[PDB]
Design a binder for this molecule. Structure first.
Ligand SMILES: [Mg+2]
Length: 222
């Protein structure tokens, strides 16, 4: 069930059909890698999951990107009359000393996914302190409908985190929660990504059942 990180095959990004999928594609964020790994696929169609990378401090030529591509994930829901799109990225390891595996996320809060004029009302993310929310995001941080984020090491908090940025970032093929295979969805609901005995690394998969809704309520920026 566990396969090499550099061998996990991403899902292709389908042409979106459902209202939920169309909105998730429309508002796909972009990601600039300032520090650490590029994002990787965590799971493939048959449910096999990535083995990630052991933490081994500074290393040249590890996790710069899979030969098979990359991935970004999204799950969406109505929260207090606002449509929340939570995007998540997986990385094979993460600093802050560090750990195998990593997850980061950005929530794009929009008014109405069904509207041709759907609009970003807010953004929240896995920031170094709190969720670094903006309601709405400043224009300098948004490229069209795409929020610009940076994956970085915050050296004051000692955390691997996301922040908004003016700089252009990279896009990844999007697979939405509803369009995952049953097997892949099971693996993401059920895998423990934290190797510590007492779960101290904060490595819950942010889109999974019983984390997803709770995170949306915690991050609520309005
Ligand atoms: Mg982090």
């Amino acid at each position: 069930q566990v396969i090499g990180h550099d061998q996990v095959r991403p899902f292709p990004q389908p042409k979106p059909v459902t209202v939920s999928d169309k909105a998730a594609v429309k508002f796909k964020p972009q990601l600039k890698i300032a520090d650490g790994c590029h994002p990787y696929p965590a799971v493939q169609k048959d449910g096999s999951i990535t083995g990630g990378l052991k933490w081994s401090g500074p290393q040249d030529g590890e996790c710069t990107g899979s030969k098979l591509g990359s991935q970004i994930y999204a799950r969406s829901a109505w929260v207090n009359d606002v449509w929340a799109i939570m995007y998540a990225w997986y990385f094979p390891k993460g600093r802050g000393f560090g750990h195998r595996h990593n997850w980061e996320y950005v929530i794009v809060w929009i008014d109405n996914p069904k509207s041709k004029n759907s609009t970003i009302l807010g953004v929240s993310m896995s920031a170094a302190v709190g969720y670094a929310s903006q309601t709405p995001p400043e224009a300098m941080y948004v490229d069209g409908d795409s929020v610009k984020l940076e994956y970085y090491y915050n050296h004051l908090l000692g955390s691997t985190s996301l922040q908004l940025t003016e700089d252009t970032g990279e896009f990844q093929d999007l697979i939405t929660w509803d369009e995952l295979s049953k097997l892949a969805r099971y693996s993401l609901n059920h895998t423990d990504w934290d190797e510590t005995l007492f779960d101290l690394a904060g490595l819950k998969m942010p889109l999974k059942d019983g984390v997803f809704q709770e995170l949306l309520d915690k991050a609520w920026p309005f």
